[PDB]
């Protein structure tokens, strides 16, 4: 009597809702699709793969649309020995933990606030100084309530023997640049800062790219674990056309187009930490000093092949496509106030920006944007157009955290900054707002960084400024433009 | 010869799903949409922000429409000082690890299972007897096999220095209840244990609110460390139209209507937590006692600017939204079986419900739903509809886990249960399904509960249902109702 | 003036994306849907549950259709007691720590490079000799860098006293086998093996099925916390019809058929691991020695209420569904070069493999598909059809991770491979690729295993594939087939 | 436009590149080439000396 | 990799390989690996991928 009776119980208002109802939950109806398959090919570089040079391939035409795109790169294993008990010791330079620049940049700012006898004091002693001495510098600078100094004293359990690791997600600073080419014109630009950046915001969860770009999560133990032997990284290659299928590039379209990926490689130097200063890095297997011919890389494409009569149609009319594009802003930091002029075009969804202490990228910690001491970099930000403020000035909590919980499939661990014109910065294929700055005379992004931000050891510290925004790729004849 | 082969092998099933096919995978196909822009911008309260008050605040006419809301909040960095040293040591009560209640209260429950001296036993001697009284109690009263002793032995390492710190989750417990009012109308009300439950149930992996409502998943060290500074915390407020851009609130279509947000603010003496009893609680910058006016809090609203021709549309014609509002049963808890009488109105989409220990809340552990020494507080649940079972007997991990699975984004870590009438209850703008309670005479929540619960040091624990409910609001002639 | 120019800096490129907009983001739209209500009841099986049995139920016609399926499984708590001390000691055998087959299994592959005198060598010194010798071999076989002895001396903190516990994630490992009969026929069929690998790749972050299949993640100690009490879990059954509410079985629509699900138990043998051989383990309750009528089950099924006229539509025409299969494909590895001929049947979606080691299933470990040490136990596949190379060789991290991110929710944290042929395996109402096995002679997955897998100790591990597959499910007066 | 060459340049051995197409006509053509600067040691000193 | 930039139609292709220190020693027809094994373990033709 109840169940019928509330079906009967219906009025004006439910009208607008289940009048002349156009779905039911009890029955399923599906649409037909045309056929296709899917192939994963991979292809070798047309040049020489090696660190710190330039590479490029042209992409092969094994199907009728491109869809996902992989940089498959293979690391050899490291080993570590001795420069005394090598028979040519000459190598590139290493950071070392021995000599951990990152930790001796933060002691030089809290320098002036050790009381007494430092110089001269015993090691335990000088590392209960300098924890004193953070207390007086957070308080003075912050109001901070002094922490415990055994709560500061944190050792990290550094084993006790040699080694050497690659980078923490070194699949992602392998590549300082790669750019998608056709027809001898550059489509796309995406660099490391930028697709770490991505991954941070847009890396959903039980999704994260950790193993396939060869991240811990900054736990050191487990790079040196994987850096022992060979390592197979798959590192994804974010371009508009792997993002929805609908997207897919048609290859068959683009006929008279040659097709390119071109990748910038990170120099080797960059791309290692050591136990310690003296010690020789050595490929695991060969058993020879690391040299810059031992970066090996490849490309694997996923093809789209189409039925005869969707493949003809396509090539009649494959018409246009929304794609997103990258534009950077790269700035040089040596004062806590900072204005960085966002001389980027067309209708962007949205930014993110970002700092690196020099500390912290000659520590190989390239993915490290924390301040001093492990702080927010950032204490606040205004972006204006026109010299009017669009945005007035926000604390970094609320560039980092609030857009990201309203625009964002995640939250950052790491000091990323992000704002949004877009409803929907993450779907490829429905625009939902944009601000066209090709039509603004000056935009600005206005940081108040953190005190002593800049300063001393830290003297050249980066702003990454990524813009997203919306163009058309057009093919006609068999060109893309 | 086979993938062209399996484009013609089609039979009769095939034409329901690929026959005039209106989609293609190799072609994107784009809407386009109306230009719109996005402002966000803070606002102080109309009234002055206190703990344990009530404030307002009447939100400004930015923009065309309003999306998201986020109470910020400021607290200020916790320092502690010994009475004795203090020249005005009169302060609220705050409460205190020295005298935790609620481990108190799980020792009385099993004081008739102590067996030998325990009130002329050392220290480590009392540890023991509790340890072994609490397997002999939970082998009388769940047929549990004891737990080896050193397993029940957990030291909470806690830190040998003086410490005051927020409680978990303060950004939600500072918010006691929040009303959004139209034209001096409540149009929804949501509560600090609503607010807490939605994000356990509906927070999204890789976006939980943690940092922006200081929620630490009960880790005191990192309750400590945050508490020693300022902190800034973004808590959204979840308004139907903060759910979809769709439903974004009208601020044009209701030009003669203020819009109202009202507070009630937590009590002082409720939001902090001390090592122990014989501290008083210092504002860590200006070094004086904490009180009631340390409190401050802004509204950030995300305005929406529209284009003229959709503006004026929309002021034309802004017809009706389907909301979903909040209704809540709060009911004191004295006896293992509990009757929760519902009488909420309207279509019910799903309801919540919980329970707190009051040694729980008295420990200022807001948030812990945990029954006696951590178990499940409710053994089953029955939901009755006039008398007659709509759902019959089910156990607890049956309402906390089963429903969460089926219609939640997230399981609660907490023992938080649900029952969901929708489908998709997350969906904010398609009804999935719902029971209309303003057609039943009666509503029960019958309740089993774990043994000696709400008995003794724990008379007056507290049961919160809350239901969600759709009804409609409609704009007319500058008026909204 | 700025937001009024963009809204006007309007092209012929704009009029593709915005001219004629059918959809505004500040006006909610929402569709009327039918009345219905959802329903869970839990229902006992038609035959005695009972380990290493087979049982079935017949589906109670309680509503118009069936949603979500799920069994109920309830364990006794586990106690154990000493062999000597039992007035009856005759009990099946259990796996046991103390005789650890995998350790024993992964020390006899390292036995031919320990060098010295192993068999009279002291414990610690056999501790020794053993990652010294898995050093050289791993030197040897993968040109490994040794690590640190003491890294590889990895102590599980094992408790110093006696127990027994239900293996990781026994939820899944009791149901060898479900199938889903209707009328006689088997609609479909699951396994244990894949029911864990669906959850690895489909399980969603946040909503694991880890409490309610009792999976611990491979943490000892909370599996005995959990199995020292009474558990309930409640499996979820993944059938074609719980995917969808639109997929929902329509039980008014097929009135002459019995519905039955049919489950095949595990042996009672390997469902326990108990701390040492000489043990007897007891039901914690009543304590006797744990035998095969212990096991409880029954069936939790939500059931549909339609509206009378959407009910009376249903029953006139439920004409098709759409529905998933899933094959099976069980084979010994004996060898490190292994061919799988795959004989499954209609429009495949994608397929998963994985290993297990004889060992591994042995211990009690069921869901541990790595290799020797903890390896990947695979280390390229190949797919052919027609002898001729649809995926060429890739390594098992483009098997495992790359197709896992291209094509599901989740990467498996085990050694589960995948290949979809569809460009969204995960949705269950829009078909977006497959390839045809009823038209293809031969399908062959080769593998190329790791060194000395299926050898010696590990001689006959297997080899797992399961697919998914299209097919049509038909409803016409009262019937389904 | 500076482009490297297609295989390995070394002392002693043939190398080539192919031109690419980044524009209408190829007038200059420059082979950029960079020589490492030059130190001595006495054999006796060198750990290798061959 | 070896990219066999070879025109016109070819009948036919021969591939081996020396040893530095085979070269070194005199040995100029000794393409054997090391030890005297066989150099080469596999080998794969394509023609554009």
Redo the contacts between chains.
């Keep these: 009597a109840?169940?019928?009776?509330?079906?009967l119980?219906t009025g004006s208002?439910?009208?607008?809702?289940?009048?002349?109802?156009?779905?039911?939950?009890?029955?399923?109806?599906?649409?037909?699709?045309?056929?296709?398959?899917?192939?994963?090919?991979?292809?070798?570089f047309?040049?020489?793969v090696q660190f710190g040079?330039?590479s490029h391939i042209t992409v092969?035409r094994?199907g009728?649309?491109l869809s996902?795109m992989?940089l498959?790169i293979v690391l050899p294993?490291?080993?570590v020995q001795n420069q005394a008990d090598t028979?040519?010791p000459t190598q590139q330079s290493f950071a070392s933990l021995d000599n951990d620049v990152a930790a001796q940049a933060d002691v030089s700012h809290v320098l002036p606030y050790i009381e007494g006898a430092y110089t001269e004091a015993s090691l335990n002693t000088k590392e209960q100084l300098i924890a004193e001495a953070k207390n007086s510098y957070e308080a003075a600078k912050?109001?901070?309530?002094?922490?415990?100094v055994?709560?500061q004293m944190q050792s990290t359990e550094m084993?006790?023997?040699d080694y050497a690791y690659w980078t923490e997600a070194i699949g992602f600073h392998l590549i300082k640049r790669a750019e998608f080419k056709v027809g001898?014109a550059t489509i796309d630009t995406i660099w490391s800062e930028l697709l770490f950046a991505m991954e941070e915001l847009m890396?959903?969860?039980?999704?994260?790219?950790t193993?396939?770009i060869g991240r811990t999560l900054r736990r050191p133990t487990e790079l040196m674990?994987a850096s022992?032997?060979?390592q197979?990284l798959?590192v994804?290659l974010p371009w508009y056309f792997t993002k929805?299928?609908?997207?897919?590039f048609?290859l068959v379209a683009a006929t008279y187009h040659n097709i390119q990926l071109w990748v910038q490689w990170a120099q080797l130097n960059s791309c290692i930490i050591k136990s310690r200063s003296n010690l020789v890095v050595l490929h695991?297997?060969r058993n020879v000093p690391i040299s810059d011919d031992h970066l090996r890389a490849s490309l694997?494409c996923?093809y789209?092949?189409?039925?005869?009569a969707?493949r003809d149609a396509?090539t009649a009319n494959?018409?246009?496509?929304?794609i997103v594009q990258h534009q950077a802003h790269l700035q040089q930091v040596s004062s806590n106030n900072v204005t960085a002029r966002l001389n980027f075009n067309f209708p962007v969804l949205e930014f993110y920006y970002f700092l690196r202490r020099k500390a912290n990228k000659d520590a190989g910690d390239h993915f490290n944007f924390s301040g001093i001491g492990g702080r927010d970099p950032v204490v606040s930000a205004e972006l204006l157009?026109?010299n009017?403020a669009?945005?007035?000035q926000?604390?970094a909590?609320?560039w980092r955290?609030?857009q990201?919980?309203?625009f964002?499939?995640?939250?950052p661990l790491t000091n990323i900054y992000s704002y949004?014109?877009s409803?929907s910065p993450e779907d490829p294929?429905?625009?939902?707002?944009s601000?066209?700055f090709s039509?603004?005379d000056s935009v600005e992004l206005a940081l108040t960084l953190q005190d002593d931000f800049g300063a001393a050891h830290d003297a050249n510290s980066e702003l990454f400024v990524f813009a997203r925004s919306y163009n058309?790729l057009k093919f006609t004849n068999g060109l893309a433009g």
Tied chains: 1, 2, 3.
């Design positions: 109840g169940s019928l009776t509330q079906l119980a208002m439910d009208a607008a809702l289940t009048q002349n109802a156009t779905r039911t939950f009890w029955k399923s109806s599906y649409q037909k699709h045309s056929l296709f398959a899917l192939e994963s090919i991979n292809q070798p047309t040049t020489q040079a330039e092969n094994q009728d649309l996902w992989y498959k294993g490291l080993k028979v040519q912050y109001n901070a309530a002094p922490l415990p055994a709560a084993p006790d023997f001898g890396g959903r969860a039980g999704r994260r790219l193993e396939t674990k022992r032997q060979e197979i798959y994804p929805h299928p609908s997207l897919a048609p695991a297997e694997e996923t789209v092949h189409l039925e005869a969707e396509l494959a018409g246009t496509q929304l157009f026109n009017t669009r945005v007035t926000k604390p909590v609320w955290a609030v990201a919980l309203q964002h499939s995640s939250a949004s014109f409803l294929i429905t625009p939902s707002g601000a066209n039509r603004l058309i």
